[PDB]
Each structure stands twice: as C-alpha cells, then as structure tokens.
UniProtKB/Swiss-Prot annotation:
Catalytic activity: Release of N-terminal amino acids, preferentially methionine, from peptides and arylamides
Designated name of the protein: Methionine aminopeptidase
GO CC list: cytosol
Gene3D superfamilies in UniProt: Creatinase/methionine aminopeptidase superfamily (3.90.230.10)
Annotated cofactor note: Binds 2 divalent metal cations per subunit. Has a high-affinity and a low affinity metal-binding site. The true nature of the physiological cofactor is under debate. The enzyme is active with cobalt, zinc, manganese or divalent iron ions. Most likely, methionine aminopeptidases function as mononuclear Fe(2+)-metalloproteases under physiological conditions, and the catalytically relevant metal-binding site has been assigned to the histidine-containing high-affinity site.
Gene Ontology MF terms: initiator methionyl aminopeptidase activity; metal ion binding; metalloaminopeptidase activity
Job description of the protein: Removes the N-terminal methionine from nascent proteins. The N-terminal methionine is often cleaved when the second residue in the primary sequence is small and uncharged (Met-Ala-, Cys, Gly, Pro, Ser, Thr, or Val). Requires deformylation of the N(alpha)-formylated initiator methionine before it can be hydrolyzed.
Xref: Pfam families: Peptidase_M24
Species whose genome carries this gene: Escherichia coli O157:H7
The protein's assembly and partners: Monomer.
Gene: map
Family membership noted in the UniProt record: Belongs to the peptidase M24A family. Methionine aminopeptidase type 1 subfamily.
Amino acid sequence: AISIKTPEDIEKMRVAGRLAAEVLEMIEPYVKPGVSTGELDRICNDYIVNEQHAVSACLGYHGYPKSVCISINEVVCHGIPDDAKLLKDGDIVNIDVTVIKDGFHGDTSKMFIVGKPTIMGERLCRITQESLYLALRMVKPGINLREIGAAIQKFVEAEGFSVVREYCGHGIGRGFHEEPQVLHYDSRETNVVLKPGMTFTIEPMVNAGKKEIRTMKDGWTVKTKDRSLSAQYEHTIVVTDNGCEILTLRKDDTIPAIISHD
Ligand SMILES: O=C(O)c1ccc(-c2ccccc2Cl)o1
Ligand SMILES: [Mn+2]
Ligand SMILES: [Mn+2]
Ligand code: NA
C-alpha cells in the first residue's frame, strides 16, 4: 500500500530534501562551459559526504555507477557523469540528486543552461519547470494523480512538446522509489487520490520533439529517439491538509515552499 509519513518522518524528509536542494544550489557556479560532468559528480559527492554528512542514494541503485545523474541536451535522463564529457556554450543540463540522510531520501533535479542560452533551450526548460509548477499547484488532499498527470501532459503538448512515458515520479521516504507511481501524463491506469502526509516526487521529462526514447549501450544513458532536446525538473513534496510543501525548494525556484489552498 501507500505510506503516510508521521510528523517525525516528515521532518526528516525536510532535512533530506533541503540537503538535496542544497547540492543543486552548491553546484550551480560550477556548471559552466569547459567543466566535465565527471567533475561535477565528484564535487557533488564530496559535498554530500564531507559537508552534509549524507550519502548519495544513486550510487549502486539498480547498479547506477555514479553519485548524481547528469544529462545533457538530447539526453533525457540517467546521463552518466564522465570526466571526458565537457559542457559547452548553449547546453542545457540536468543534474539530478538524491541524498539519504537519517534514513530518508531527498530527491530533486533542475536544469542549468550553460553559457549563452539558446531560445529553444530557455523555452524548453522554462516550460518543463512550469509543467512541474502547475502540477505542484494542483497538489492537495482529494485530488487524483491522474488529474495532475493529465494536466502536465496537456500543458506540455500545448507547447508543442512531448512527455516521456517510460519514467515517472514516485513515492519517497526510507525508500528511494516507493508507491505510488506519479505519471506525468494521462493514463487510465492511474487512480491514486492524494492524502495528507504522502511524500512523493513530480519530475516530468519533456522532449522538444517526439516522446520516443532510446537507451545507449552503456545500459544507462537515455536519449530522445529524434535527438531533440529534453528537459526535466524534479521536487520532493509532502501533501499537507490544504495543499503541499516543497521539501527541495531552492533559492532560484519561482514558486513558494508552502502552497496553500481554500
Ligand atoms: O527517481 C529519480 O529521480 C531517479 C533518478 C535516477 C533514477 C534511477 C532509476 C532507475 C535505476 C537507477 C536510477 Cl539512478 O531515479
Ligand atoms: Mn531524481
Ligand atoms: Mn525521482
Ligand atoms: Na536533456
């Protein structure tokens, strides 16, 4: 079944979420032309281990070889940090972090635009983040995840973009991926009504082109089949009595931590 976090667990999630968000805030200045994704990963891991006294939940997860996932341009997700992969002017890059602290996971990612942004890159990232934001604003007890997934897809598709179907958001807590699955599109299979205390992620993967993807032969790197740009933003949240609280909010987020309804 689905778990409803206790006040104590929610506090631990706040701590874990804050740490994950802080890794993204910390790494930002390093995401510039010339840097390798491999070094960004090491910088993130050193910070997580030595500064936050936490641990990356990604390393070893289903065999994932690195500490954080770094995906560039057409790479949709699971990009493997490589000391030989350099960021360049115009690149859009997603750094996805998941830390475990005091037994709980904080999961979040954001897009970084490297050097001079390309209007398409800016547009895709902005729209992708806005799709996450619109979804967050819908979160509150009584709402069905199907409605949220449908809303995300409708928005994204109205922009001329597509939503990746192979991946979804997820419940989170002592487990990296717990129930329920949080699809970012409309599916007849989705029937999960939100309840206070639920902690999960919303992390839409949006392609500028077609939805189809391909996994490279390193068994991890996923790219858009048409090699169009793909962007993703992710936040871990806790459903409150009248909305939700974003546990991985950053200083650069343009949405409040506490979203209240009435
Ligand atoms: O939920 C996430 O944000 C996420 C990022 C990477 C993964 C993942 C999924 C499946 C196998 C390995 C990994 Cl690292 O999951
Ligand atoms: Mn993630
Ligand atoms: Mn996630
Ligand atoms: Na991408």
